[PDB]
Enzyme design. Structure first.
Site, mmCIF file in Angstrom:
data_model
loop_
_atom_site.group_PDB
_atom_site.id
_atom_site.type_symbol
_atom_site.label_atom_id
_atom_site.label_comp_id
_atom_site.label_asym_id
_atom_site.label_seq_id
_atom_site.Cartn_x
_atom_site.Cartn_y
_atom_site.Cartn_z
ATOM 1 N N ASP A 147 1.124 -2.635 -0.646
ATOM 2 C CA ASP A 147 0.359 -2.209 -1.817
ATOM 3 C C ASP A 147 -0.232 -0.813 -1.631
ATOM 4 O OD1 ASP A 147 0.666 -4.561 -3.402
ATOM 5 O OD2 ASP A 147 -1.009 -5.533 -2.328
ATOM 6 N N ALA A 148 0.445 0.021 -0.843
ATOM 7 C CA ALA A 148 -0.058 1.357 -0.561
ATOM 8 C C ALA A 148 1.110 2.311 -0.319
ATOM 9 C CB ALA A 148 -0.998 1.314 0.621
#
Ligand SMILES: [Ca+2]
Ligand SMILES: [Ca+2]
Ligand SMILES: [Ca+2]
EC number: 3.2.1.35
Length: 589
Positions: free
Chosen positions: A269-270
């Protein structure tokens, strides 16, 4: 024949048996840790046996030998002389251990103290099945794990497990040779949104207790750090990078000082660093070098590093995965099986290995994160099965780097699934039958931790037959529940069926082998009574065909009233979602 889980890779009984003497002589080799010795003390104590440690084999009483291959100790020597084996065994198999029980001598020899602990754990289970006043049958097990990394992760969306819950799950897994509890609770900011920050002392002391339990059970505590989502590790300059690496070492040092002995890196998620995924490898290698240096101070520290990429749902073709695959051999790449709700699947695994490979860098096997029995998309339900759906029988173990399960927010309810992963990951199920046998046996161990069938284990298994379906769309394969009842459903026989279930739920509520478990699933046990009343009435259904209809309607509505907290709202327990609840409605009108 003893019931042993996980299933030994090989076990043979040469006939013969013996009584174990009241007083025991224990021999140890150098390298056996305090945790293994403590487990041994616990095992004999629970059999009401008195033991003395010495450095020699004592004739004329039962000897207990626990040792390390090639340690040059007494136990190592005894096994060479008396228990024939090939040395290559310990090189070519993981967690290799031989358990020998013959005519007065009980021996374990392993490649390391962890696997020595595994061998002693086999004997723990054996000692719970002893006949006629500590009579034990002669046997030999040549045992090893087919998957190096085995356990579970607190990575679901839901309420965190309590600190006591965590200890309990590590204890449980510690009886079935699991070696990983991955700590990633979303409510702990120190692992993500405050990753740069050191823990304050009172929180640290709680970590200490988790790490300690992790070391005592060998269900090792793994601290997962996400340094890429929030004020991430910088790769814009060497200066920034070295500072940031240094923050990680500081975080890890604090944890090393409080008994933590394994780490994991999360990166989902990055964004990747500037220049992309090659910078992960840079970071992981540097961390690995550091960890190696830390082994002087902390010899039991593991350098194995799980890495969760941002495309764990992928097939291994992506550029990011290929880059990560250039990492050293101590790095594992976490995948969920080709979609979010994927399975341990040979096809997926083999493709991943082909797809991620590049010139000079053969594709490693994937490390599976399995979203089972995860219920965060099925919040009203317990998922009390699905073994062979998610853990495919027959998978070639060289295609599996590791397996950890992402389970239910209700800590205790996950024991059936932990028992599945423990067995499977240790010894790949040959077929569905093995999967089903595991499932069947699991409730005995979940309920009271032994091979003995009790009424409570019988009752727990009985209701669990009807609490498996996830009531989800096709993003996951549907799990089959009520498999024997569902044909019958497609009346007085049916009253038998339903009153049988009603009694099992009641009996389990009243007389659980484990009171923690019962308390955590109380919502479903109460739901069961009302659900069984609803159906029972309708089945009974001039004055009485009204009455047994109108009783039912009220019971069914009461069945939806048993709520528990779920993060920021209340969820209501539901049982038999697949067949029983529809059938109550089909009969309804
Ligand atoms: Ca040897
Ligand atoms: Ca080995
Ligand atoms: Ca009958």
């Amino acid at each position: 024949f003893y019931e042993i889980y996980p299933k030994p890779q090989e076990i043979s009984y040469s006939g013969g048996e013996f009584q174990i003497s009241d007083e025991i002589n224990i021999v140890y080799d150098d390298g056996i840790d305090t945790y293994t010795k403590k487990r041994v003390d616990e095992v004999l104590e629970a059999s009401n046996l008195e033991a003395t440690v010495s450095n020699e084999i004592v004739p004329g009483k039962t000897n207990f030998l626990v040792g390390i291959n090639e340690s040059g100790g007494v136990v190592d020597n005894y096994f060479n002389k008396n228990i024939p084996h090939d040395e290559s065994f310990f090189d070519e198999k993981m967690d290799a251990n031989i358990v020998s029980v013959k005519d007065g001598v009980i021996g374990v020899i392993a490649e390391d103290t962890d696997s020595a602990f595994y061998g002693v754990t086999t004997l723990k289970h054996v000692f719970n099945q002893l006949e006629e006043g500590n009579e034990i049958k002669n046997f030999r097990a040549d045992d090893y794990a087919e998957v190096a990394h085995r356990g579970f992760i607190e990575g679901y969306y839901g309420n965190p497990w309590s600190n006591e819950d965590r200890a309990e799950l590590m204890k449980f897994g510690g009886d079935y040779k699991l070696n990983q509890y991955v700590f990633a609770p979303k409510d702990d900011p120190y692992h993500n949104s405050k990753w740069r920050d050191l823990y304050p002392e009172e929180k640290l002391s709680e970590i200490k207790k988790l790490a300690q339990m992790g070391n005592e059970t060998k269900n090792r505590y793994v601290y997962a750090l996400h340094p890429f989502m929030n004020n991430p590790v910088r790769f814009d300059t060497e200066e920034n990078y070295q500072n940031d690496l240094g923050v990680i070492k500081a975080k890890f040092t604090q944890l090393l000082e409080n008994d933590v002995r394994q780490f994991a890196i999360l990166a989902d998620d990055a964004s990747a660093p500037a220049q992309g995924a090659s910078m992960y490898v840079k970071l992981l290698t540097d961390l690995t070098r550091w960890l190696e240096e830390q082994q002087s101070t902390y010899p039991d520290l593991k350098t194995d590093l799980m890495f969760c990429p941002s495309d764990y749902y992928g097939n291994g073709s992506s550029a990011q995965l290929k880059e990560l695959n250039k990492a050293e051999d101590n790095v594992s790449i976490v995948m969920t099986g080709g979609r979010i709700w994927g399975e341990v699947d040979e096809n997926f695994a083999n493709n991943f290995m082909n797809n991620i490979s590049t010139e000079g860098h053969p594709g490693r096997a994937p490390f599976f994160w399995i979203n089972w029995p995860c219920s965060d998309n099925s919040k009203q339900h317990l998922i009390m099965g699905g073994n062979d759906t998610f853990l495919h029988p027959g998978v070639d173990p060289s295609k599996i780097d590791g397996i950890v399960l992402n389970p239910m927010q209700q800590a205790e309810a996950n024991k059936s699934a932990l028992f599945a992963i423990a067995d499977y990951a240790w010894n790949i199920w040959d077929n569905k039958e093995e999967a089903d046998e595991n499932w069947n046996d699991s409730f005995k161990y979940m309920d009271h931790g032994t091979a003995e069938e009790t009424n409570s284990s019988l009752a727990l298994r009985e209701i669990s037959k009807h609490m498996i379906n996830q009531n989800m769309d096709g993003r996951v394969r549907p799990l089959q529940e009520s498999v024997e009842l569902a044909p019958k459903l497609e009346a007085l026989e049916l009253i038998e069926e339903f009153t049988n279930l009603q009694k099992a739920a009641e009996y389990y509520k009243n007389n659980p082998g484990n009171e923690r478990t019962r308390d955590q699933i109380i919502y479903w046990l109460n739901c069961w009574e009302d659900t069984m009343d609803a159906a029972i009435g309708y089945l009974k259904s001039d004055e009485a065909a009204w009455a047994n209809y109108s009783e039912a309607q009220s019971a069914f509505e009461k069945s939806k009233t048993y709520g528990f907290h779920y993060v920021d709202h209340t969820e209501y327990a539901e049982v038999g979602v697949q067949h029983i609840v529809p059938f109550i409605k089909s009969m309804g009108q």
